[PDB]
């Protein structure tokens, strides 16, 4: 199982670089071409935008706590539809378990609560995994590197949401927001 563990420098080379607007610079400098399933360590619980800024095809999104699909494949996994004795339906019952979207700096941004939507390059691109109950999701981003400083991260701030001091609206990333890869 590919459970996440935080990137621990020295590493063959995924250079974390938390910095201060607050954001997170990156870079696979060394000749290691593949697999950067960059889940963030601090999942939401159910307003809160989530910017990402690729510097150089990246599957930005959100992820349910379980997830062991460590594969080269883009776009993989479940719609539910509770029925009736009538043979009809109590129609739909949520879906999916999660969010993802496939020179210049691409800038992808999410949002948060019961709904969530992508907003690529400051422009709307809504609906992809836009309903859930009172559940949880990591602010994850899957990546295959371009080498050239591969990726960067960031309505009220997400930091207000992850942690107890809600509101306190302005950003402060704070130390715990580590950036695990899904190790083999």
Q: How many CB atoms lie within 10 A of CB 150?
A: 22
Instruction: Give 129's contacts (C-beta < 8 A, 6+ positions apart).
Output: 61, 62, 95, 96, 98, 99, 116
DSSP string, 135-182: -EEB--EEE---SSS------EEHHHHHSSS----S----TT----EE
CA distances from 162 to 33, 106, 166, 170, 182 (A): 32, 25, 9, 13, 21
Enter the resolution in angstroms: 3.8
Which technique? cryo-EM
- Of 156, 116, 123, the closest CA to residue 139 belongs to 116
- Of 50, 35, 76, the closest CA to residue 180 belongs to 35
Contact status, residue 24 vs residue 175, Cβ threshold 8 Å: no
């Amino acid at each position: 199982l590919p459970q996440f563990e935080p990137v621990p420098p020295e590493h063959p080379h995924y250079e974390v670089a938390r910095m201060d607007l607050a954001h997170r610079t990156w870079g696979s400098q060394n000749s290691l071409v593949e697999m950067l399933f960059l889940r963030l360590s601090l999942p939401v619980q159910f307003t809160y935008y989530y910017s990402v800024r690729v510097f150089a095809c990246v599957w930005v999104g959100w992820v349910t706590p379980d997830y062991h699909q460590h594969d080269m494949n883009f776009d993989l996994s479940v719609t539910v539809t509770m029925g009736d004795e009538q043979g009809n339906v109590h129609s739909s019952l949520k879906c999916s378990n999660y969010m993802v979207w496939g020179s210049h700096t691409d800038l992808v941004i999410g949002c948060l609560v019961g709904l969530m939507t992508f907003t690529a390059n400051g422009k709307e691109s809504n609906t992809f995994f836009q309903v859930e109950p009172n559940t949880k999701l990591f602010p994850a981003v899957f990546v295959l590197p371009t080498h050239q400083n591969v990726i960067q991260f960031e309505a009220a701030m997400f930091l207000s949401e992850r942690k107890n001091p809600a509101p306190q609206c302005p950003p402060r990333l704070e130390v715990q927001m580590l950036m695990p890869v899904s190790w083999s």
